Design a protein around this ligand. Structure first.
Ligand code: CHL
Ligand code: CHL
Ligand code: CHL
Ligand code: CHL
Ligand code: CLA
Ligand code: CLA
Ligand SMILES: CCCCCCCCCCCCCCCCCC(=O)OC[C@H](CO[C@@H]1O[C@H](CO)[C@H](O)[C@H](O)[C@H]1O)OC(=O)CCCCCCCCCCCCCCCCC
Ligand SMILES: CCCCCCCCCCCCCCCCCC(=O)OC[C@H](CO)OC(=O)CCCCCCCCCCCCCCCCC
Ligand SMILES: CC1=C[C@H](O)CC(C)(C)[C@H]1/C=C/C(C)=C/C=C/C(C)=C/C=C/C=C(C)/C=C/C=C(C)/C=C/C1=C(C)C[C@H](O)CC1(C)C
Ligand SMILES: CC1=C[C@H](O)CC(C)(C)[C@H]1/C=C/C(C)=C/C=C/C(C)=C/C=C/C=C(C)/C=C/C=C(C)/C=C/C1=C(C)C[C@H](O)CC1(C)C
Ligand SMILES: CC1=C[C@H](O)CC(C)(C)[C@H]1/C=C/C(C)=C/C=C/C(C)=C/C=C/C=C(C)/C=C/C=C(C)/C=C/C1=C(C)C[C@H](O)CC1(C)C
Lengths: 35, 222, 221, 44, 100, 242, 222
């Protein structure tokens, strides 16, 4: 059950890091209009 | 942030004043910090520059090699009694178990200090002789201080502007690491514990667990 | 060979390419070891070499004076106040005093203040004459580093072709003497015993009794 | 005790970790994603 | 405060940069917005230290955990342990921990 | 720098939206130091009466600064542990009435028993103060040897400017530049007005509470709700409102 | 006169036995007794910066030499005024005592307890002072970096040129004497564990044996 916790923690940390750094990566610039 | 040219950041800020004339900011890490004056001669400046960079790299390696094993021992790696703290790591070879890497008995397991010192002397002497000569078997003529080639396999130093910025990054990381290495040297003889142990003791109560707790340790006694 | 661009160097072939341009090799004892670059300016190079030569001769005196009383005490049987070199200064404080051969009829000094005073005045005059290079007729000449006259009674200062050769010999074994006396200084603090005493303990068992056995004595607590 | 549990619930464990390996994998995953983002920022 | 607010709403200056550059600000001036944020952060820090001063020196704050059923207790030696405080801020929000 | 304190666009005693720029009296046009346009009563009259009262204001300002320091510092030393014997300002004269004498505390090597009696102190004070106040109006001083200029003669005060005499009174210089001189003049008059307000506060607080201002501030910082004007005006306490 | 310590025939570091003065050491600057045996001031910029930091060390050593003995000189018969912290090398522990660091033993003066706060105040004030010294500030910007003398010298003195030069060499000689005294204070503190004034009293009690030779065997590696 410890390795299940390790796997779930790794998965959650991975997806949260994707969320955070994707919104960091120039997110207001993805618009069809100017600015 | 314009680390070169005449408008580079200086060693004291707006209160620094005019930097020395020979410190034109051409070389990385040029803040003008030469208040002693041991770089008036350009040859002496070059020798001290390569000495400083070699010290920097050796200090990055040394600082990481001091910090890692004590954290590993605190994180479950079976460093037995004194291999965790750097100034007792050399004491591991005079026991029966020897240098057991990562606490594993069948890893390294070395007990001949004479032989390991000998092979270090020949190997490192060959390495430093190749470095000092600037020419090695299989290596052509190139920059002695910043060779690249086989020493930069990734080859991400090809761009000149990125190379200069990374040179500034390298010298600043080096200065920080060698400041930290002298911190380790002074902190070991003053406290008697590892640097991570000192950090953990300081984080418990920083009011009393500071450098002033050992200010009265070395007082002379009649 | 020891002179010119084909001279011996401090890293052998490893010193072939990167050699400082001001290490021409005209000056004796030149192996090209100025990798820290303290001697770019040849006036400070001249200063550094005269301090180097003075230290070389001084450490030749020192290294011959460290070994001689202890070798005479162990391998010749003569008794002294203390043949240990770092404990040979306190024997003037003993009731017997300081004896040159262990006999009270030789030297037999008891006044550390008086012997310090006479040593200071004699060596102050000698070193002031050396630094000034003589004055008022007597010894008001020469090069104040390799004098010759009034200092070479055996006539070996002549024949410059071999004179430079044993000058290189002088600098080389003076460097050996400085290295040996630094070893004496470090061995005094670490082992706490005389140099040939540690040598004799080394010959009994070189496997265990070495410098690494006492390497744990300076660990912080 | 008839069965084995970690018993890590409660006690105010930081980020819920009861072993150092959990904090290490969290830090390693964040560092890997940060390194990828940093070396691959600004669309290269 | 109501007099001041009514004054600036009715007959106050319309815009502040042309007369009071210290109080004038545009929304795109990140330096000016961070300056205002820093002023308010210093004010909030002084506000928290006001409660700290009251608890430490002005003999206040009611401890319900005092023996006998609670009492107004002047607090001596508050626990300023960084590991402790950050442990409260990073613990779970559920029943066993309760977060904050 | 200088425009903020001089000229038509200067800091007034009321802001622009609360006071129009033409509501300032015509004799206060921002040419003197500390000009805030504050004169609700008809006391300034004209510019020459304003200049004449400026001398009184500056003398009272400097005397009030010396005052405020002389009330705060010795009482604080006495309350903190120095052997002052009369640090409180409204009772320091009663310690020399019969035979007593004030101990002088020249920090850090303080505590000295002065042997001059009250009669000698009063006589020398009247003599010296009359001499300096007569020299101020006449503008004549016999001797010299000031750090500003080495051994100045008597013919140096003549031709100087009254109420601001440079030279022997300026050992540290830092006032020959007119702009920083004017800014420092504004600083001096504002500090003097603050000192006047402070010493009036010291007198009124002493009459109300019966203790010195240092005791007042220390007790207020110890308990602000338990010791203030409201508390000292009340008396002992009130019955709790239950 | 001035020619006794500024001309080519000035007094030197060896008297009449000093005909080997280096050629770049002529007699333009204060002091200048021809003592350059090491020869490491050969570069003029290095020599100038050495002289600047030498005079800084001289002023600091004058202040330190006069300040280490003043509490020990003002110490009373038994020690109400100063406790254990009457001696200079154990004066810092005065911040850790129960009463606090009083100036002359009374609570009305200083009475500081926070060594961290006083070190932070020291760091800020001294950083500002040193930045103003090497750049310029409220005192003066374009002044002489070694002899400003317009706000720090308001008592005249440095107005007549020959007098200013004579007091300049007075300053450098007193500073060198104070440096020698401070080094003596350090070494005496290391080997005796007693204050300089009480060491002087023990030496005056019996100079036959109360000398450094009484402590010559202290550092013997037993
Ligand atoms: C930069 C290299 C280096 C340094 C700093 C040290 C430092 C140390 N080794 Mg060591 N070693 C080094 C290289 C090597 N050692 C060994 C083999 C051993 C053994 C077998 C043992 C030691 C031990 C010790 C410690 C002795 C206790 C002491 O004096 O603590 C107080 C001193 C300090 C905390 C710091 C002192 C150094 C610092 C001031 C650096 C100053 C600059 C350098 C001297 C520059 C020159 C470096 C050159 C010579 C490599 C000590 C901290 C002993 C030990 O751990 O005992 C418990 C021990 O048993 N060493 C080898 C051969 C493989 C080395 C090869 O390079
Ligand atoms: C006429 C002869 C004469 C002589 C011989 C000297 C000699 C000296 N002068 Mg001097 N002077 C002389 C005349 C004059 N001087 C001056 C003015 C000055 C000044 C202003 C200064 C000197 C200084 C010096 C010294 C510079 C070298 C030094 O420090 O060596 C080092 C000395 C030695 C090596 C001597 C040996 C010492 C040793 C026996 C002591 C014991 C050693 C330990 C036991 C070892 C311990 C090791 C471990 C265990 C710790 C030196 C001893 C300088 C100095 O250093 O002043 C303090 C200096 O600043 N002189 C004047 C006035 C114009 C003179 C006029 O005639
Ligand atoms: C030049 C400055 C300076 C010097 C020489 C000293 C020296 C000393 N302080 Mg100290 N302090 C100094 C500055 C400061 N101290 C303090 C605060 C304290 C406290 C709170 C305490 C001390 C204590 C001590 C003593 C520790 C016992 C000992 O044997 O130490 C080693 C001494 C020697 C080996 C003698 C030789 C000294 C020599 C190596 C120093 C000069 C060269 C340095 C390498 C320069 C270092 C950089 C500069 C900028 C300081 C010691 C004599 C302690 C004490 O007195 O305990 C009884 C103590 O409790 N100091 C502050 C902050 C306000 C300082 C700020 O500048
Ligand atoms: C210049 C302003 C000045 C002020 C505001 C006061 C104010 C006061 N004096 Mg005073 N004095 C002043 C000047 C002087 N006094 C004295 C000598 C005394 C004495 C001897 C006494 C006072 C006392 C007093 C108080 C009651 C009267 C108090 C209100 C009395 C006091 O302290 O009562 C408690 C008191 O006994 N004063 C001298 C001569 C040295 C002064 C010279 O300028
Ligand atoms: C006895 C040592 C000594 C001597 C002979 C001099 C001499 C000189 N100094 Mg100097 N100075 C000294 C120590 C000394 N200084 C120290 C320790 C500091 C650090 C605080 C300074 C910092 C300093 C600065 C910043 C400047 C000078 C300047 C000068 C020159 C002219 C002004 C002057 O001070 O005349 C000397 C007049 C005297 C009456 C001798 C002083 C005797 C003192 C007052 C005895 C009392 C000491 C006291 C107990 C110590 C408490 C310290 C406290 C005052 C801070 C002159 C050649 C100025 C200059 O460069 O000229 C252009 C200048 O800019 N000095
Ligand atoms: C968010 C608060 C705030 C801010 C940013 C401003 C800003 C401004 N006011 Mg203003 N004002 C305020 C509140 C505020 N006011 C309140 C509550 C009142 C009622 C008393 C006034 C009444 C007022 C008038 C009558 C005028 C201004 C004017 C001005 C402008 C000129 C500069 C100035 O400060 O004038 C000066 C304002 C004062 C001196 C008020 C006193 C403030 C003191 C120093 C208290 C310091 C605050 C301290 C931290 C305590 C905070 C309260 C605490 C209990 C929490 C300026 C842009 C002038 C203007 O509009 O120009 C045309 C002007 O005519 N204000
Ligand atoms: C919207 C509205 C939000 C309103 C309110 C928000 C309330 C609280 C905010 C969070 C407070 C808790 C801080 C973190 C505490 C913590 O991590 O505990 C960690 C907890 C506790 O973890 C458990 O702890 C127990 C001991 O108490 C045991 O040890 C268990 O074995 C262990 O699993 O686990 C979690 O709940 C992590 C959930 C992660 C969810 C991430 C979602 C991210 C979404 C978007 C990305 C955002 C950026
Ligand atoms: C159990 C303990 C509980 C308490 C601990 C909680 C720690 C939380 C610390 C997070 C704070 C970091 C703020 C960065 C936010 C994004 C900045 C950015 O937009 O960043 C982007 C920015 C672009 O300019 O770049 C930059 O300025 C670089 C700045 C970012 C700094 C990088 C972080 C250090 C990297 C270390 C790597 C870990 C490596 C893997 C270790 C493996 C161990 C086995
Ligand atoms: C610039 C300038 C200018 C001005 O003007 C003047 C002056 C002052 C002169 C200057 C400055 C200078 C400085 C700062 C210096 C410093 C240095 C350092 C710090 C070094 C160290 C340096 C340091 C270093 C290298 C270090 C290194 C380290 C090492 C190797 C370690 C190793 C190890 C390890 C891993 C662990 C184990 O277990 C043990 C051992 C084996 C032991
Ligand atoms: C080259 C180079 C180049 C690079 O680049 C850089 C660098 C690094 C700088 C370099 C190097 C250098 C070095 C090596 C140095 C060292 C030195 C020494 C060791 C000396 C000694 C030196 C030494 C010496 C003098 C010594 C001496 C001794 C003596 C006197 C002794 C005496 C004695 C005796 C008899 C005996 C008795 O019982 C005691 C006594 C009485 C005590
Ligand atoms: C010229 C020449 C030439 C040739 O050729 C080469 C050569 C050899 C390089 C040369 C020589 C040199 C020399 C002699 C050097 C020496 C120096 C010194 C001694 C310094 C000190 C210097 C010294 C010094 C600064 C000092 C300072 C001091 C101080 C701050 C103090 C402080 C203090 C006090 C008040 C008191 C308290 O309670 C404590 C404390 C806090 C601690």
């Amino acid at each position: 059950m410890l390795t299940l916790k390790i796997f779930v923690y790794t998965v959650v940390t991975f997806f949260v890091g994707l969320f955070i750094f994707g919104f960091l990566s120039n997110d207001p610039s993805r618009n069809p209009g100017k600015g | 942030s314009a680390w070169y040219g005449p408008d580079r950041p200086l060693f004291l800020g707006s209160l620094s004043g005019e930097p020395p004339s020979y410190l034109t900011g051409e070389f990385p890490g040029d803040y003008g910090w030469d208040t002693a004056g041991l770089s008036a001669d350009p040859t002496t400046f070059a020798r001290y520059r390569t000495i400083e960079l070699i010290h920097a790299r050796w200090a990055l390696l040394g600082a990481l090699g001091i910090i890692t094993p004590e954290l590993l021992a605190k994180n479950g790696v079976p460093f037995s009694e004194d291999g965790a703290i750097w100034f007792k790591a050399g004491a591991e070879i005079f026991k029966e178990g020897g240098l057991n890497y990562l606490g594993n008995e069948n890893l390294i397991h070395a007990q001949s200090i004479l032989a390991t010192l000998a092979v270090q002397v020949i190997v490192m002497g060959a390495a430093e002789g190749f470095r000092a000569n600037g020419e090695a078997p299989g290596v052509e003529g190139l920059d002695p201080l910043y060779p690249g080639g086989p020493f930069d396999p990734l080859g991400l130093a090809d761009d000149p502007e990125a190379f200069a910025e990374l040179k500034v990054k390298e010298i600043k990381n080096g200065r920080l690491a060698m400041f930290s290495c002298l911190g380790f040297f002074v902190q070991a003889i003053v406290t008697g514990k590892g640097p991570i142990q000192n950090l953990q003791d300081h984080l418990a109560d920083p009011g009393v667990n500071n450098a002033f707790a050992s200010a009265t340790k070395f007082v002379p006694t009649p | 060979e020891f002179y010119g661009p084909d001279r011996a160097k401090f890293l052998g072939p490893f010193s072939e390419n990167d050699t400082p341009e001001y290490l021409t090799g005209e000056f004796p004892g030149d192996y090209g070891w100025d990798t820290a670059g303290l001697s770019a300016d040849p006036q400070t190079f001249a200063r550094y070499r005269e301090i180097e030569l003075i230290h070389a001769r001084w450490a030749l005196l020192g290294a011959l004076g460290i070994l001689t009383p202890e070798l005479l005490s162990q391998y010749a049987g003569v008794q002294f106040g203390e043949p240990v070199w770092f404990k040979a200064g306190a024997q003037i404080f003993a009731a017997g005093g300081l004896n040159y051969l262990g006999n009270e009829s030789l030297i037999h000094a008891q006044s550390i203040i008086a012997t310090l005073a006479v040593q200071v005045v004699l060596m102050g005059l000698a070193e002031a004459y050396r630094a000034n290079g003589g004055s008022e007729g007597f010894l008001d000449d020469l090069d104040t580093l390799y004098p010759g006259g009034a200092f070479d009674p055996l006539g070996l200062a002549d024949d410059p072709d071999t004179f430079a050769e044993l000058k290189v010999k002088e600098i080389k074994n003076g460097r050996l003497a400085m290295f040996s006396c630094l070893g004496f200084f470090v061995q005094a603090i670490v082992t706490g015993k005389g140099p040939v005493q540690n040598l004799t303990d080394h010959l009994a068992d070189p496997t265990v009794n070495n410098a690494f056995a006492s390497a744990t004595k300076f660990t912080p607590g | 005790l008839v069965d084995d549990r970690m018993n890590g619930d409660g006690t105010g464990l930081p980020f819920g970790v009861n072993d150092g390996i959990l904090g290490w994998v969290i830090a390693g995953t964040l560092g890997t994603i940060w390194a990828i983002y940093f070396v691959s920022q600004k669309d290269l | 405060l109501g007099f001041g607010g009514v004054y600036h709403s009715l007959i106050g200056p319309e815009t502040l940069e042309e007369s009071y550059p210290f109080f004038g600000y545009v929304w795109k001036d990140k330096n000016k917005m961070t300056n205002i944020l820093g002023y308010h952060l210093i004010i909030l820090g002084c506000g928290a230290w006001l409660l700290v001063l009251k608890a430490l020196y002005f003999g206040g704050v009611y401890d319900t955990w005092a023996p006998g059923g609670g009492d107004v207790r002047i607090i001596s030696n508050p626990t300023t342990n960084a590991a402790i405080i950050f442990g409260y801020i990073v613990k779970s929000p559920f029943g066993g921990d309760g977060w904050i | 720098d200088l425009e903020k304190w001089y000229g038509p666009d200067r800091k007034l005693f009321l802001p622009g939206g609360l006071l129009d720029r033409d509501d300032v009296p015509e004799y206060l046009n921002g040419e003197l130091a500390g000009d805030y346009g504050y004169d609700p009563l008809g006391l300034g009259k004209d510019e020459e009466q304003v200049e004449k009262y400026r001398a009184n204001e500056l003398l009272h300002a400097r005397w009030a600064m010396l005052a405020a320091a002389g009330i705060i510092i010795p009482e604080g030393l006495q309350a903190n542990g120095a052997d002052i014997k009369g640090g409180t300002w409204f009772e320091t004269g009663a310690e020399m009435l019969n035979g007593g004498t004030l101990n002088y505390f020249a920090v850090p090597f303080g505590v000295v028993q002065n042997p001059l009696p009250l009669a000698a102190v009063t006589l020398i004070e009247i003599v010296l103060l009359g001499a300096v106040e007569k020299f101020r109006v006449d503008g004549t001083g016999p001797a010299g040897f000031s750090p500003g200029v080495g051994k100045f003669d008597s013919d140096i005060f003549d031709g100087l400017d009254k109420l601001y005499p440079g030279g022997p009174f300026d050992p540290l210089n830092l006032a020959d530049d007119p702009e920083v001189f004017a800014e420092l003049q504004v600083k001096e008059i504002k500090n003097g007005r603050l000192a006047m307000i402070a010493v009036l506060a010291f007198a009124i607080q002493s009459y109300v509470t019966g203790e010195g201002p240092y005791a007042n501030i220390t007790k207020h910082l110890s308990d602000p709700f338990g010791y203030n004007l409201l508390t000292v005006l009340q008396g002992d306490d009130r019955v709790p409102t239950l | 006169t001035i020619n006794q310590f500024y001309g080519p025939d000035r007094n030197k570091w060896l008297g009449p036995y000093s005909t080997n003065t280096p050629p770049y050491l002529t007699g333009e600057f204060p002091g200048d007794y021809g003592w350059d045996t090491a020869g490491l001031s050969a570069d003029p910029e290095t020599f100038k910066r050495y002289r600047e930091l030498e005079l800084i060390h001289a002023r600091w050593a004058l202040l330190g030499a006069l300040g280490m003995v003043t509490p020990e000189l003002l110490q009373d018969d038994d020690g109400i005024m100063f406790g254990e912290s009457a001696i200079w090398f154990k004066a810092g522990a005065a911040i850790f005592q129960e009463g606090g660091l009083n100036y002359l033993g009374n609570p009305s003066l200083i009475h500081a307890q926070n060594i961290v706060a006083t070190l932070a105040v020291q760091v800020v004030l001294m950083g500002l002072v040193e930045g103003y010294r090497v750049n310029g500030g409220p005192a003066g910007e374009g002044l002489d970096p070694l002899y400003p003398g317009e706000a720090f010298d308001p008592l005249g003195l440095a107005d007549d040129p020959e007098a200013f030069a004579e007091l300049k060499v007075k300053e450098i000689k007193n500073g060198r004497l104070a440096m020698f005294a401070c080094l003596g204070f350090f070494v005496q503190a290391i080997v005796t564990g007693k204050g300089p004034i009480e060491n002087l009293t023990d030496h005056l009690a019996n100079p036959a044996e109360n000398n450094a030779f009484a402590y010559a065997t202290k550092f013997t590696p037993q």
